[PDB]
Amino acid sequence: NASVVSKGLANLSLELRKPVTFDIITADTLEQAIERAGTKHGNKGWEAALSAIEMANLYKSLRGTGHHHHHHGSSIEIYEGKLTAEGLRFGIVASRFNHTLVDRLVEGAIDCIVRHGGREEDITLVRVPGSWEIPVAADELARKEDIDAVIAFGDLI
Amino acid sequence: FDYNASVVSKGLANLSLELRKPVTFDIITADTLEQAIERAGTKHGNKGWEAALSAIEMANLYKSLRGTGHHHHHHGSSIEIYEGKLTAEGLRFGIVASRFNHTLVDRLVEGAIDCIVRHGGREEDITLVRVPGSWEIPVAADELARKEDIDAVIAFGDL
Amino acid sequence: NASVVSKGLANLSLELRKPVTFDIITADTLEQAIERAGTKHGNKGWEAALSAIEMANLYKSLRGTGHHHHHHGSSIEIYEGKLTAEGLRFGIVASRFNHTLVDRLVEGAIDCIVRHGGREEDITLVRVPGSWEIPVAADELARKEDIDAVIAFGDLIR
Amino acid sequence: FDYNASVVSKGLANLSLELRKPVTFDIITADTLEQAIERAGTKHGNKGWEAALSAIEMANLYKSLRGTGHHHHHHGSSIEIYEGKLTAEGLRFGIVASRFNHTLVDRLVEGAIDCIVRHGGREEDITLVRVPGSWEIPVAADELARKEDIDAVIAFGDL
Amino acid sequence: NASVVSKGLANLSLELRKPVTFDIITADTLEQAIERAGTKHGNKGWEAALSAIEMANLYKSLRGTGHHHHHHGSSIEIYEGKLTAEGLRFGIVASRFNHTLVDRLVEGAIDCIVRHGGREEDITLVRVPGSWEIPVAADELARKEDIDAVIAFGDLI
Amino acid sequence: NASVVSKGLANLSLELRKPVTFDIITADTLEQAIERAGTKHGNKGWEAALSAIEMANLYKSLRGTGHHHHHHGSSIEIYEGKLTAEGLRFGIVASRFNHTLVDRLVEGAIDCIVRHGGREEDITLVRVPGSWEIPVAADELARKEDIDAVIAFGDLI
């Protein structure tokens, strides 16, 4: 599975007369755990952002003046939110405590909004000393009329 | 029974209900390994933070000691006290770091830079110099310290 | 070795009357291992970029017309690729699978390219969901005219 | 002590009290068997969901790579990055499934169809083909893939 | 490490023709614990005051009419509070119960505000019988329009 | 790995109707050990030259009049030495004692200096009878105004 891509890249190098290199990495018992922790935290942040995108679009559709697809049959309205973060302004609140792990969630939540059609100019980040101050900063962030969803990352347990 | 995680959740839920805006609340969950990694990281950060804080205090003490200013008293007992204010406003700093073990010395440097900035230190006044190893530090530190527009020099080695 | 530097810095601080400080970061057995892993990945990406730089320079010299060097004063011509990456356009393809470790190779290659005189404007990065679609994105990018070398980074094994 | 089931109940009770409307709140209760059944079902659903998501990303990467558009940068460092947006708007898809083990492959197909639709994929652009077994897949997949109005083909076998 | 300073002080005494003395203290097994408890309580009070200074400056900047430094790249606003307690009025509430230990926190919290640029004339201290009366006194203290932050020290657990 | 090269070259030779020959060489343990020793010596010389190149560029940019190359995003300025030996003049000091070993390091540094863009006219080599004359010879080489770095290799230990 890994040798075939190298063979193809070698053949492409011979065909195109260009230097094409290919490289892999061998992992011991510990780097696997490190990478798994990083991937898990990134996935947590990704899901946290996705759950807010869906709720924002659900709010957009629920108050709208047009109904959409019914149930598996008909005569039963269904309301749901699309995973399209286009034109939505977000606000992220993170805690400086354990920043070496909170920043992983922050980075894994920004790129989801970017890849779902959102531009970085509509993202506002706020950092607070600890988890205790999260609600009172999220309150002031929500006070802004140019905010559609709030994502908050703490560090406990 | 935590007195913290319960109250933050109650406050966030009531805020979301009162303002009709989604507030996703997520925390971390570590078990005996990520806790150790995080503790090592924050220990390195605190090491660099106090490394910069001591230099700030010493610079302010030097400025106040040889300056002409009537200082305050302990409590009003006329015994004047000379001490260094933790206000790095107007001070210029120079940091020397060795790229050997950069994955940790960079955490030290970052934990010192923000310590300087948050205390009022302007970003224009911090100068960073990198050297291949600790054995190169003395000459570069001498060159930085000879400058008149430098109030403190902080350096980081390797282990 | 670590003591002479600190003593010199203390003497300099005493001479110039300014807070010159020196601090050394300790390391336990776990953080030593994580630092070792990071350094290993960085060096892997560094050499991966260096080889491509040399090959691109050699190919440019072969296609060009310059009798730059000779061997020990003899009339024979020896063709060699310099390690100056100025004026070369690169293309990096990386698998997002195990991105925590792949990004180290990516940043090491970028650091080597920029340190060898290259520019960040001439680097093009492509991310693919896995290693099985590396060939198609690789050849699609490599068939572009403004690309001098292609470096591919797969996912971890074992 | 759950931080979730308590807060949802408190919020629903306060909502019912404040709005004078009955809000029946019921949850599930499983013991070591329904949990396993649900986990198997959601695992199959996630398998089909990621199966469709990878195809969406690859189609968008193909469109962007050979297209004439100045792409954004990593952080502002002029290194342009080519990546596939997860917006299946305007893309047309074809799914091939084998009715062998339909009670699971239909869950896969359903977990892919909603994944396409929620990302902006219109329902008019999804074409589904069923075959008696996996051995019939290659020819039908060839017939679907030869079509010009098809941007991706997803297929499901049996085990 | 301890003899070099004494040698330097002796040389300075000989140079300047002035009486310069130097003295250290040897600690047994118990005075170390006493000093560590005192230092720990002082540090707790110091951190308690610092976390309120940062929040006060965060409130000052968050409602202001000027944005500041972005993220590691750009296009993402970041809001944070400086550790400059200049011009800020504080209010401390302490409990008389276990005063022999609460006063340590009070003293370790006053000097932090003093050393961060705050003058003692902007500090107001209130003592209450027990921890139960802390919120209702902090309410009246916050009712004052010349208060920017409240720090409260109880004694339980 | 080794034979695919031969198959490809045979195919190319048949395509072009032109003699292309490929062959390999078999080695025993003694030759393997001596060649790995030689390669180790070459690598040592290579690293020794690379460090000097970086330090010379660092000093030149540190005392250069222009100020640029700020950190990404922030306004702080980072001083670092590029690995480009163009325009730099070097000086090498070697001892005739164990020349069979010293010359390998000398060549392993000269080739690095040349391959990093450095012209051969800027390299100056000085040989001394032993390592005990290195200090004064290096002093005399350093006193020159057209020398940017000095690298000195001693005897075996």
Using CB atoms within 10 A of its CB, is residue F73 exposed (0-12), middle (13-18) or buried (19+)?
Answer: middle
The 8-class DSSP code of residue A67 comes to: -
HEC sequence for chain D: CCCCHHHHHHHHHHHHHHHCCCCCCCCCCCCCCHHHHHHHHHHHHHHHHHHHHHHHHHHHHHHHHCCCCCCCECCCCCCEEECCCCCCCCCCEEEEEECCCHHHHHHHHHHHHHHHHHCCCCHHHEEEEEECCHHHHHHHHHHHHCCCCCCEEEEECCC
Which is nearest to C116 in space by CA: C24, C51, C58? C51
Give D3→chain B minimum CA distance, Å. 7
The 8-class DSSP code of residue F131 comes to: G
D92 half-sphere exposure, CB direction, 13 A CA radius: 9
Query: For residues E123 and A78, what is the distance between their CA atoms, to the nearest angstrom?
Result: 58
Report how many Cβ contacts below 8 Å link chain D to chain E. Answer: 7
* Contact call for C and F: 3+ CB–CB distances under 8 Å: yes
DSSP H or E run through C74 = none
Q: Is the dihedral of CA F142, F148, F154, F157 positive or negative?
A: positive
Q: Does F86 sit within 8 Å of C116, measured CB to CB?
A: no
Give C45→chain A minimum CA distance, Å. 9
Resolution in A: 7.0
Residues of D in contact with C141 (CB under 8 A): 65, 82
Report in angstroms the alpha-carbon separations of B130 from B106, B137, F79: 10, 9, 7
Query: For residues F56 and F69, what is the distance between their CA atoms, to the nearest angstrom?
Result: 18
Closest E-chain CA to F74 = E72
Sheet order of strands, D126-131 included: D126-131, D93-98, D152-156
Residues of B in contact with E117 (CB under 8 A): 85, 87
In sequence order, what are the residues at sequence separation of 6 or more whose Cβ sits closer than 8 angstroms to the Cβ of residue F46? F108, F109, F111, F112
Determine how many CB atoms are found less than 10 A away from the CB of residue D106.
16
Query: For residues F69 and F57, what is the distance between their CA atoms, to the nearest angstrom?
Result: 14
- Which 3 state secondary structure label does DSSP give E115? helix
Instruction: Report residue E119 as tokens.
Output: 């003058």
Which is nearest to A112 in space by CA: D85, F141, E70, C71? D85
Determine how many CB atoms are found less than 10 A away from the CB of residue F10.
13
Q: Which residue in E71, E79, E83, E157 has the most chain B C-beta atoms within 10 A of its own C-beta, making it the best mutation to test that interface? A: E83
Determine how many CB atoms are found less than 10 A away from the CB of residue D133.
12
Q: Subunits with at least 3 CB pairs below 8 A relative to chain F?
A: B, C, D, E
Which is nearest to D87 in space by CA: D151, D155, D43, D148? D151
Query: For residues C121 and D74, what is the distance between their CA atoms, to the nearest angstrom?
Result: 11
Beta pairing partners, D94: D127, D153
DSSP string, F14-36: HHHTS----------HHHHHHHH
Which is nearest to F154 in space by CA: F142, F137, F28? F137
Q: Subunits with at least 3 CB pairs below 8 A relative to chain A?
A: B, C, D, E
Q: Does B5 sit within 8 Å of D10, measured CB to CB?
A: no
- φ, ψ for residue D154, nearest 5 deg: -120, 140
Query: For residues B8 and F20, what is the distance between their CA atoms, to the nearest angstrom?
Result: 76
In sequence order, what are the residues at sequence separation of 6 or more whose Cβ sits closer than 8 angstroms to the Cβ of residue E75? A120, A121, D76
Using CB atoms within 10 A of its CB, is residue A134 exposed (0-12), middle (13-18) or buried (19+)?
Answer: buried
Determine how many CB atoms are found less than 10 A away from the CB of residue B103.
15
Instruction: Report residue A84 as tokens.
Output: 């399209």
Residues of B in contact with C10 (CB under 8 A): none
Q: Does E76 sit within 8 Å of A123, measured CB to CB?
A: yes
Q: Which residue in F54, F63, F76 has the most chain B C-beta atoms within 10 A of its own C-beta, making it the best mutation to test that interface? A: F76
Residues of C in contact with B146 (CB under 8 A): 16
Query: For residues E20 and E14, what is the distance between their CA atoms, to the nearest angstrom?
Result: 9
- Which 3 state secondary structure label does DSSP give C77? strand
The 8-class DSSP code of residue B151 comes to: S
Which is nearest to A136 in space by CA: E54, E139, B98? E54
Cα E42–chain centre separation: 8
SS3 content of chain E, % helix, strand, coil (to 5): 50, 15, 35
Say how many residues make up chain E: 157
> At how many degrees (to 10) do helices A99-115 and B34-65 cross?
110
> What would you report as the CA-atom Rg of chain B, rounded to the nearest whole angstrom?
22
* Contact call for B and F: 3+ CB–CB distances under 8 Å: yes
* Placement of tokens 């610092």 in the chain: E50
Report in angstroms the alpha-carbon separations of E106 from A129, D101, D129, E132: 21, 72, 75, 18
HEC sequence for B130-142: EECCHHHHHHHHH
> What distance, in Å, lies between the first and last C-alpha atoms of chain E?
41
Closest by Cβ to F117, choosing from C80, C84, C115? C84
Q: Subunits with at least 3 CB pairs below 8 A relative to chain D?
A: A, B, C, E, F
Chain breaks in chain B (C to N over 2.5 A) after: none
Using CB atoms within 10 A of its CB, is residue F139 exposed (0-12), middle (13-18) or buried (19+)?
Answer: exposed
Closest A-chain CA to E80 = A127
Beta pairing partners, C149: C90
User: Under the phi-then-psi rule, with left for phi > 0, alpha for psi from -120 to 50, and beta for the rest, what region is A138?
Assistant: alpha
Q: Is the dihedral of CA D152, D153, D156, D157 positive or negative?
A: negative
Give C144→chain D minimum CA distance, Å. 9
Could you tell me if C153 and C94 are in contact, meaning their C-beta atoms sit under 8 angstroms apart?
yes
For residues D4, D7, D11, D12, the Cα torsion angle rounded to the nearest 10 degrees is: 60
Give C63→chain D minimum CA distance, Å. 27
Query: For residues D134 and D159, what is the distance between their CA atoms, to the nearest angstrom?
Result: 10
The maximal CA–CA distance of chain B, rounded, in angstroms, is 62
β-pair type (F77-79, C149-157): unpaired
- φ, ψ for residue E137, nearest 5 deg: -85, -35
Which is nearest to A23 in space by CA: F59, E140, C41? C41
Closest by Cβ to A135, choosing from B15, B26, B38? B15
Could you tell me if C150 and C138 are in contact, meaning their C-beta atoms sit under 8 angstroms apart?
yes
The 8-class DSSP code of residue C146 comes to: T
Query: For residues A68 and A80, what is the distance between their CA atoms, to the nearest angstrom?
Result: 9
Report in angstroms the alpha-carbon separations of D83 from D70, D87, D150, F6: 13, 12, 21, 39
Residues of B in contact with A135 (CB under 8 A): 8, 11-12, 15
Could you tell me if D58 and C135 are in contact, meaning their C-beta atoms sit under 8 angstroms apart?
no
Which is nearest to A85 in space by CA: A52, A108, A62, A59? A52
In sequence order, what are the residues at sequence separation of 6 or more whose Cβ sits closer than 8 angstroms to the Cβ of residue D108? D44, D45, D47, D48, D51, D97, D156
Give D120→chain B minimum CA distance, Å. 22
Closest by Cβ to E115, choosing from B85, B120, B123? B85
Determine how many CB atoms are found less than 10 A away from the CB of residue E3.
7
Determine how many CB atoms are found less than 10 A away from the CB of residue F122.
18
Q: Which residue in A100, A103, A145 has the most chain B C-beta atoms within 10 A of its own C-beta, making it the best mutation to test that interface? A: A100
In sequence order, what are the residues at sequence separation of 6 or more whose Cβ sits closer than 8 angstroms to the Cβ of residue D45? D107, D108, D110, D111
Q: Subunits with at least 3 CB pairs below 8 A relative to chain C?
A: A, B, D, F
Could you tell me if C108 and C43 are in contact, meaning their C-beta atoms sit under 8 angstroms apart?
yes
Strand intervals (E) in chain F: 77-79, 90-95, 123-128, 149-152
> At how many degrees (to 10) do helices C29-63 and A29-62 cross?
80
Q: Which residue in F69, F72, F78 has the most chain D C-beta atoms within 10 A of its own C-beta, making it the best mutation to test that interface? A: F72
Q: Subunits with at least 3 CB pairs below 8 A relative to chain E?
A: A, B, D, F
Sheet order of strands, C123-128 included: A20-26, C149-157, C90-95, C123-128, D80-82
Residues of B in contact with C19 (CB under 8 A): 54-55, 58-59, 151-154
Could you tell me if F52 and F151 are in contact, meaning their C-beta atoms sit under 8 angstroms apart?
yes
The b-or-e profile of A78-107 (16+ CB within 10 A means b, else e) is eeebbbbbeebbbbbbbbbbbbbbbbbbbe
Give E80→chain F minimum CA distance, Å. 16
* Placement of tokens 């670092």 in the chain: F80
> At how many degrees (to 10) do helices A134-143 and B5-19 cross?
10
Using CB atoms within 10 A of its CB, is residue C111 exposed (0-12), middle (13-18) or buried (19+)?
Answer: middle
Report in angstroms the alpha-carbon separations of A140 from A120, A145, B13: 21, 11, 15
- φ, ψ for residue F90, nearest 5 deg: -120, 165
Residues of A in contact with C156 (CB under 8 A): 24-27, 31-32, 35
Beta pairing partners, B96: B129, B155
Q: Does A147 sit within 8 Å of B27, measured CB to CB?
A: no
> What distance, in Å, lies between the first and last C-alpha atoms of chain A?
41
β-pair type (D152-156, A123-128): unpaired
Could you tell me if C100 and A32 are in contact, meaning their C-beta atoms sit under 8 angstroms apart?
no
Q: Which residue in B118, B122, B124 has the most chain E C-beta atoms within 10 A of its own C-beta, making it the best mutation to test that interface? A: B118
Q: Does B58 sit within 8 Å of C24, measured CB to CB?
A: no
Determine how many CB atoms are found less than 10 A away from the CB of residue B158.
21
Which is nearest to D58 in space by CA: A86, C130, A53? C130
Query: For residues B93 and C2, what is the distance between their CA atoms, to the nearest angstrom?
Result: 23
The 8-class DSSP code of residue F71 comes to: P
SS3 content of chain A, % helix, strand, coil (to 5): 50, 15, 30
A39 half-sphere exposure, CB direction, 13 A CA radius: 13
Q: Using what technique was this structure determined?
A: cryo-EM
Residues of B in contact with E69 (CB under 8 A): 123
Could you tell me if B47 and C23 are in contact, meaning their C-beta atoms sit under 8 angstroms apart?
yes
Q: Subunits with at least 3 CB pairs below 8 A relative to chain B?
A: A, C, D, E, F
Angle at C110 between CA A98 and CA B137, to 5 degrees: 70
Could you tell me if F156 and F101 are in contact, meaning their C-beta atoms sit under 8 angstroms apart?
yes
Q: Which residue in F57, F78, F84 has the most chain C C-beta atoms within 10 A of its own C-beta, making it the best mutation to test that interface? A: F84
Beta pairing partners, D93: D126, D152
Q: Does B128 sit within 8 Å of F76, measured CB to CB?
A: yes
Could you tell me if C141 and A18 are in contact, meaning their C-beta atoms sit under 8 angstroms apart?
no
Query: For residues B62 and A128, what is the distance between their CA atoms, to the nearest angstrom?
Result: 33
Q: Does B26 sit within 8 Å of A98, measured CB to CB?
A: no
Instruction: Report residue B100 as tokens.
Output: 């050997």
Could you tell me if A6 and A22 are in contact, meaning their C-beta atoms sit under 8 angstroms apart?
yes
Q: Does A82 sit within 8 Å of D87, measured CB to CB?
A: no
Angle at F153 between CA F150 and CA F154, to 5 degrees: 135
Query: For residues F92 and F150, what is the distance between their CA atoms, to the nearest angstrom?
Result: 6
